[PDB]
Structure formats: structure tokens, C-alpha cells
PDB file of C-alpha atoms and ligand atoms in Angstrom:
ATOM      1  CA  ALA A   1       0.130  -0.101   0.321  1.00 45.18           C
ATOM      2  CA  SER A   2       1.232   3.255  -1.110  1.00 47.00           C
ATOM      3  CA  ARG A   3       0.981   7.069  -1.267  1.00 48.12           C
ATOM      4  CA  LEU A   4       1.201   9.320  -4.510  1.00 47.13           C
ATOM      5  CA  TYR A   5       4.057  12.413  -4.507  1.00 48.34           C
ATOM      6  CA  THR A   6       5.463  14.013  -7.473  1.00 51.75           C
ATOM      7  CA  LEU A   7       9.226  15.561  -7.950  1.00 51.04           C
ATOM      8  CA  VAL A   8      10.116  17.717 -11.012  1.00 52.14           C
ATOM      9  CA  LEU A   9      13.688  18.626 -11.948  1.00 51.69           C
ATOM     10  CA  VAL A  10      14.006  21.774 -14.227  1.00 47.19           C
ATOM     11  CA  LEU A  11      17.066  20.141 -16.096  1.00 46.79           C
ATOM     12  CA  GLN A  12      18.906  22.592 -18.399  1.00 47.65           C
ATOM     13  CA  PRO A  13      22.294  21.365 -20.356  1.00 50.67           C
ATOM     14  CA  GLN A  14      24.415  23.534 -17.956  1.00 51.33           C
ATOM     15  CA  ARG A  15      22.182  23.777 -14.949  1.00 50.47           C
ATOM     16  CA  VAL A  16      19.129  22.199 -12.416  1.00 51.38           C
ATOM     17  CA  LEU A  17      17.334  24.027 -10.911  1.00 52.77           C
ATOM     18  CA  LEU A  18      16.892  22.943  -6.797  1.00 57.24           C
ATOM     19  CA  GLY A  19      14.834  23.821  -3.918  1.00 56.23           C
ATOM     20  CA  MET A  20      15.913  24.176  -0.449  1.00 55.19           C
ATOM     21  CA  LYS A  21      13.079  22.775   1.733  1.00 54.71           C
ATOM     22  CA  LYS A  22      12.345  25.240   5.020  1.00 53.32           C
ATOM     23  CA  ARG A  23       9.936  22.830   6.852  1.00 55.03           C
ATOM     24  CA  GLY A  24       7.686  19.656   6.930  1.00 58.29           C
ATOM     25  CA  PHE A  25       9.013  16.444   5.880  1.00 58.51           C
ATOM     26  CA  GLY A  26      12.698  16.771   5.065  1.00 56.63           C
ATOM     27  CA  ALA A  27      13.676  20.159   6.133  1.00 58.41           C
ATOM     28  CA  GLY A  28      17.097  21.553   5.452  1.00 60.03           C
ATOM     29  CA  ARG A  29      17.810  19.726   2.237  1.00 61.33           C
ATOM     30  CA  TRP A  30      17.790  20.562  -1.793  1.00 62.29           C
ATOM     31  CA  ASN A  31      15.542  18.770  -3.657  1.00 60.53           C
ATOM     32  CA  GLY A  32      12.983  19.113  -6.767  1.00 61.73           C
ATOM     33  CA  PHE A  33       9.793  20.187  -6.556  1.00 62.32           C
ATOM     34  CA  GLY A  34       6.688  19.002  -5.450  1.00 59.24           C
ATOM     35  CA  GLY A  35       4.473  16.461  -3.296  1.00 57.55           C
ATOM     36  CA  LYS A  36       1.354  15.227  -2.198  1.00 61.88           C
ATOM     37  CA  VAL A  37      -1.382  14.321  -5.049  1.00 59.85           C
ATOM     38  CA  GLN A  38      -4.852  15.074  -4.038  1.00 60.36           C
ATOM     39  CA  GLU A  39      -7.832  13.645  -5.287  1.00 60.28           C
ATOM     40  CA  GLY A  40      -9.426  14.901  -8.716  1.00 58.93           C
ATOM     41  CA  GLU A  41      -6.404  15.715 -10.274  1.00 58.65           C
ATOM     42  CA  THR A  42      -3.807  13.990 -12.443  1.00 61.97           C
ATOM     43  CA  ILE A  43      -0.539  13.053 -11.081  1.00 58.83           C
ATOM     44  CA  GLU A  44       1.132  15.564 -13.840  1.00 59.14           C
ATOM     45  CA  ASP A  45      -1.155  18.300 -12.827  1.00 56.92           C
ATOM     46  CA  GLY A  46      -0.657  17.804  -9.260  1.00 55.50           C
ATOM     47  CA  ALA A  47       3.340  17.987 -10.581  1.00 58.80           C
ATOM     48  CA  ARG A  48       2.643  21.282 -12.134  1.00 58.04           C
ATOM     49  CA  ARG A  49       0.479  22.515  -9.543  1.00 62.48           C
ATOM     50  CA  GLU A  50       3.197  22.135  -6.974  1.00 64.81           C
ATOM     51  CA  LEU A  51       6.030  23.833  -8.607  1.00 63.82           C
ATOM     52  CA  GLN A  52       3.565  26.710  -9.542  1.00 64.38           C
ATOM     53  CA  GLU A  53       3.251  26.609  -5.724  1.00 64.64           C
ATOM     54  CA  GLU A  54       6.523  26.306  -4.449  1.00 60.23           C
ATOM     55  CA  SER A  55       8.685  28.119  -7.496  1.00 61.29           C
ATOM     56  CA  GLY A  56       6.064  30.413  -9.015  1.00 56.33           C
ATOM     57  CA  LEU A  57       6.943  28.755 -12.245  1.00 56.70           C
ATOM     58  CA  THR A  58       5.037  27.189 -15.180  1.00 56.20           C
ATOM     59  CA  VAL A  59       5.879  24.883 -17.893  1.00 54.74           C
ATOM     60  CA  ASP A  60       4.975  23.899 -21.532  1.00 56.21           C
ATOM     61  CA  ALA A  61       5.228  20.182 -21.055  1.00 60.43           C
ATOM     62  CA  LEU A  62       6.598  18.024 -18.503  1.00 59.71           C
ATOM     63  CA  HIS A  63       7.928  14.511 -19.799  1.00 61.21           C
ATOM     64  CA  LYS A  64       7.913  10.856 -17.424  1.00 61.68           C
ATOM     65  CA  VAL A  65      11.180  10.203 -16.273  1.00 60.20           C
ATOM     66  CA  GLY A  66      10.909   8.023 -13.494  1.00 63.91           C
ATOM     67  CA  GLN A  67       9.382   6.168 -10.590  1.00 64.03           C
ATOM     68  CA  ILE A  68      10.893   5.868  -7.011  1.00 67.00           C
ATOM     69  CA  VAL A  69       9.130   3.865  -4.062  1.00 66.66           C
ATOM     70  CA  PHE A  70      10.473   4.938  -0.902  1.00 65.35           C
ATOM     71  CA  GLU A  71       9.867   2.794   2.161  1.00 65.97           C
ATOM     72  CA  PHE A  72      10.592   4.133   5.692  1.00 66.69           C
ATOM     73  CA  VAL A  73      11.405   1.615   8.611  1.00 68.11           C
ATOM     74  CA  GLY A  74       8.666   2.055  11.149  1.00 68.40           C
ATOM     75  CA  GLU A  75       6.088   3.804   8.624  1.00 70.28           C
ATOM     76  CA  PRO A  76       3.839   1.425   7.016  1.00 71.23           C
ATOM     77  CA  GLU A  77       2.367   3.880   4.205  1.00 76.29           C
ATOM     78  CA  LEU A  78       5.106   3.449   0.876  1.00 80.36           C
ATOM     79  CA  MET A  79       6.213   7.039  -0.684  1.00 84.31           C
ATOM     80  CA  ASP A  80       5.113   6.276  -4.757  1.00 87.68           C
ATOM     81  CA  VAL A  81       6.804   9.217  -5.937  1.00 90.55           C
ATOM     82  CA  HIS A  82       6.520  10.201 -10.075  1.00 89.07           C
ATOM     83  CA  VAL A  83       9.780  11.936 -10.888  1.00 83.69           C
ATOM     84  CA  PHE A  84       8.995  14.638 -13.658  1.00 81.05           C
ATOM     85  CA  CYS A  85      11.834  16.429 -15.904  1.00 84.52           C
ATOM     86  CA  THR A  86      11.588  20.011 -18.333  1.00 84.52           C
ATOM     87  CA  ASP A  87      14.247  21.936 -19.916  1.00 82.41           C
ATOM     88  CA  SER A  88      11.623  24.672 -20.985  1.00 81.89           C
ATOM     89  CA  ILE A  89      10.177  26.897 -18.232  1.00 79.11           C
ATOM     90  CA  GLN A  90       8.008  29.838 -18.356  1.00 78.62           C
ATOM     91  CA  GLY A  91       8.754  32.792 -15.677  1.00 80.68           C
ATOM     92  CA  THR A  92      11.211  33.609 -13.005  1.00 82.13           C
ATOM     93  CA  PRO A  93      12.018  30.824 -10.026  1.00 78.44           C
ATOM     94  CA  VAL A  94      10.340  32.827  -6.536  1.00 79.37           C
ATOM     95  CA  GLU A  95      10.591  31.882  -3.245  1.00 79.27           C
ATOM     96  CA  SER A  96       7.504  30.513  -1.345  1.00 76.94           C
ATOM     97  CA  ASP A  97       6.810  29.487   2.014  1.00 76.41           C
ATOM     98  CA  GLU A  98       8.156  25.877   1.221  1.00 80.57           C
ATOM     99  CA  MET A  99      11.193  26.317  -1.056  1.00 85.26           C
ATOM    100  CA  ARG A 100      13.907  29.015  -1.916  1.00 84.53           C
ATOM    101  CA  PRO A 101      14.958  28.005  -5.304  1.00 81.34           C
ATOM    102  CA  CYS A 102      18.332  28.650  -6.686  1.00 79.75           C
ATOM    103  CA  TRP A 103      20.139  27.136  -9.812  1.00 82.43           C
ATOM    104  CA  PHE A 104      23.162  24.910  -9.520  1.00 83.93           C
ATOM    105  CA  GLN A 105      25.662  24.121 -12.202  1.00 81.75           C
ATOM    106  CA  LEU A 106      25.700  20.361 -13.007  1.00 83.38           C
ATOM    107  CA  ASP A 107      29.466  19.462 -11.364  1.00 79.31           C
ATOM    108  CA  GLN A 108      28.339  21.793  -8.456  1.00 77.92           C
ATOM    109  CA  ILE A 109      24.788  19.695  -7.442  1.00 74.35           C
ATOM    110  CA  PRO A 110      25.033  19.534  -3.631  1.00 75.21           C
ATOM    111  CA  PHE A 111      24.567  15.801  -3.152  1.00 72.66           C
ATOM    112  CA  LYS A 112      25.754  15.998   0.316  1.00 74.43           C
ATOM    113  CA  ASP A 113      22.565  18.448   1.328  1.00 72.99           C
ATOM    114  CA  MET A 114      20.181  16.481  -1.043  1.00 74.00           C
ATOM    115  CA  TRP A 115      18.428  12.946  -0.044  1.00 75.73           C
ATOM    116  CA  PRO A 116      20.855  10.460  -0.267  1.00 75.32           C
ATOM    117  CA  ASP A 117      19.357   8.414  -2.792  1.00 77.46           C
ATOM    118  CA  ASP A 118      19.984  11.293  -5.008  1.00 76.63           C
ATOM    119  CA  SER A 119      23.614  10.173  -5.553  1.00 79.82           C
ATOM    120  CA  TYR A 120      22.197   6.836  -6.854  1.00 83.42           C
ATOM    121  CA  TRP A 121      19.601   8.218  -9.547  1.00 82.47           C
ATOM    122  CA  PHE A 122      20.802  11.684 -10.811  1.00 81.61           C
ATOM    123  CA  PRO A 123      23.342  10.055 -13.112  1.00 84.10           C
ATOM    124  CA  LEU A 124      20.306   8.408 -15.262  1.00 85.71           C
ATOM    125  CA  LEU A 125      18.409  11.734 -14.842  1.00 84.41           C
ATOM    126  CA  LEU A 126      21.042  13.733 -16.530  1.00 84.63           C
ATOM    127  CA  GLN A 127      21.387  11.115 -19.112  1.00 84.67           C
ATOM    128  CA  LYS A 128      17.826  11.558 -19.975  1.00 87.22           C
ATOM    129  CA  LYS A 129      17.111   7.885 -19.366  1.00 86.74           C
ATOM    130  CA  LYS A 130      13.897   6.537 -17.857  1.00 88.16           C
ATOM    131  CA  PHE A 131      14.204   4.320 -14.144  1.00 91.59           C
ATOM    132  CA  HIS A 132      12.289   2.723 -11.828  1.00 94.82           C
ATOM    133  CA  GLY A 133      13.579   2.764  -8.569  1.00 93.38           C
ATOM    134  CA  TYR A 134      13.627   1.443  -4.802  1.00 93.91           C
ATOM    135  CA  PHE A 135      14.670   2.826  -1.507  1.00 95.77           C
ATOM    136  CA  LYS A 136      14.254   1.505   1.473  1.00 96.63           C
ATOM    137  CA  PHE A 137      15.561   4.293   4.607  1.00 94.78           C
ATOM    138  CA  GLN A 138      16.161   3.582   8.246  1.00 97.44           C
ATOM    139  CA  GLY A 139      15.220   7.285   9.298  1.00 97.02           C
ATOM    140  CA  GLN A 140      16.309  10.383   7.167  1.00 97.45           C
ATOM    141  CA  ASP A 141      20.147   9.393   6.500  1.00 94.90           C
ATOM    142  CA  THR A 142      20.314   5.754   6.014  1.00 96.24           C
ATOM    143  CA  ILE A 143      19.684   3.280   3.127  1.00 94.02           C
ATOM    144  CA  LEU A 144      19.109  -0.206   4.265  1.00 97.34           C
ATOM    145  CA  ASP A 145      19.068  -1.388   0.593  1.00 99.86           C
ATOM    146  CA  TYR A 146      17.954   0.017  -3.220  1.00100.19           C
ATOM    147  CA  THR A 147      17.198  -1.242  -6.480  1.00100.63           C
ATOM    148  CA  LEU A 148      16.859   0.828  -9.657  1.00 98.82           C
ATOM    149  CA  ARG A 149      16.629  -0.011 -13.224  1.00 94.80           C
ATOM    150  CA  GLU A 150      16.629   1.888 -16.285  1.00 94.75           C
ATOM    151  CA  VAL A 151      13.117   0.973 -18.104  1.00 96.12           C
ATOM    152  CA  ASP A 152      11.435   1.930 -21.713  1.00 92.84           C
ATOM    153  CA  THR A 153       8.075   2.823 -20.078  1.00 93.94           C
ATOM    154  CA  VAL A 154       7.423   4.621 -17.183  1.00 93.33           C
TER     155      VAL A 154
HETATM  156  O1  L3N B   1      15.001  13.069  -3.713  1.00 98.30           O
HETATM  157  C1  L3N B   1      14.250  12.990  -2.829  1.00 98.30           C
HETATM  158  N1  L3N B   1      13.501  14.188  -3.148  1.00 98.30           N
HETATM  159  C2  L3N B   1      12.752  13.679  -1.616  1.00 98.30           C
HETATM  160  O2  L3N B   1      11.252  14.317  -1.523  1.00 98.30           O
HETATM  161  C3  L3N B   1      12.648  12.350  -0.993  1.00 98.30           C
HETATM  162  C4  L3N B   1      11.453  11.715  -0.011  1.00 98.30           C
HETATM  163  C5  L3N B   1      11.746  10.750   0.817  1.00 98.30           C
HETATM  164  C6  L3N B   1      12.724   9.894   0.386  1.00 98.30           C
HETATM  165  C7  L3N B   1      13.764  10.159  -0.453  1.00 98.30           C
HETATM  166  C8  L3N B   1      13.677  11.564  -1.263  1.00 98.30           C
HETATM  167  N2  L3N B   1      14.877  11.901  -2.420  1.00 98.30           N
END
């Protein structure tokens, strides 16, 4: 049993937009934009909504790039995270209550202040490969086990 979440990475050939999370789950970490999917909206529409909410931005098209399932020891609900990607954005990243957006060079991606799974699956993101992931967490810092597989169909 699982719960739907979104994750949106604005990926430009020289840079990638991340946002610093100021409160709530996983605060004090750089991350993609997104959150819970609501009843009555599609997964992609939820991904867009959260992008607009957290960074101000709107996009033409969002591309499905992966799916990562997260399991936390002691929590029965799984996180079913649908990952999206886009180069073309409309507007300017501005700050919100949830996220402080900031651009990063592709050779300065701040992995040590990101969720530790990001080390594993970013290579496939940057190479424009579609993927299915699973990561079992113990607390916020410790990956007990994982799988990561390139797929053709997300
Ligand atoms: O890149 C990530 N973003 C997340 O929101 C996240 C949430 C829970 C576990 C890993 C995560 N990894």
C-alpha cells in the first residue's frame, strides 16, 4: 500500500533548478519540487500545481522520467514518487513558504545536502534515461537497501 507524490526537476544542459525545503518533511535539504497528489487531479497536474506553488514557475510540457518507491522503517505507508523533467520553463524562480529555489551548475550539485538516494539516480536523469527505483530508508540518513533499473516505459 502506497501514497502518490510528485517530483519535478528543471533540467537545463548546463544547470538544474533545486529548492531548499524550509519546513515539514525533509527540511534543510535541496530537492526537486512537488508534494502530495490530490483527489480529483492527474499526477502530472499535481506536479505542475506544486511547481507553481513552490517556485512560481509554469512549464509547457512535463516529461515522465521515473518512478521511485520509498519505504521508511516504522512507517507502513510507502511513498510512490513520480519523477518529472523539463528544460523549457516560463517565468522566473521566486521564493515561497515551502521552497527557496536556486540554480546549480551540473558539476556542483549539492549531494551532501540532498536526500542520499539522489547520488544513485541522478546519473540516469542527466543522461535522459527513464528509470524505476526502490529505496528502503531507516530514518532520514540511512539507506538499508535499494534497487534501480533503467526502463523503457515509466
Ligand atoms: O530526492 C528525493 N526527494 C524526496 O522528496 C524524497 C523523499 C523521501 C525519500 C527520498 C527522497 N528523495
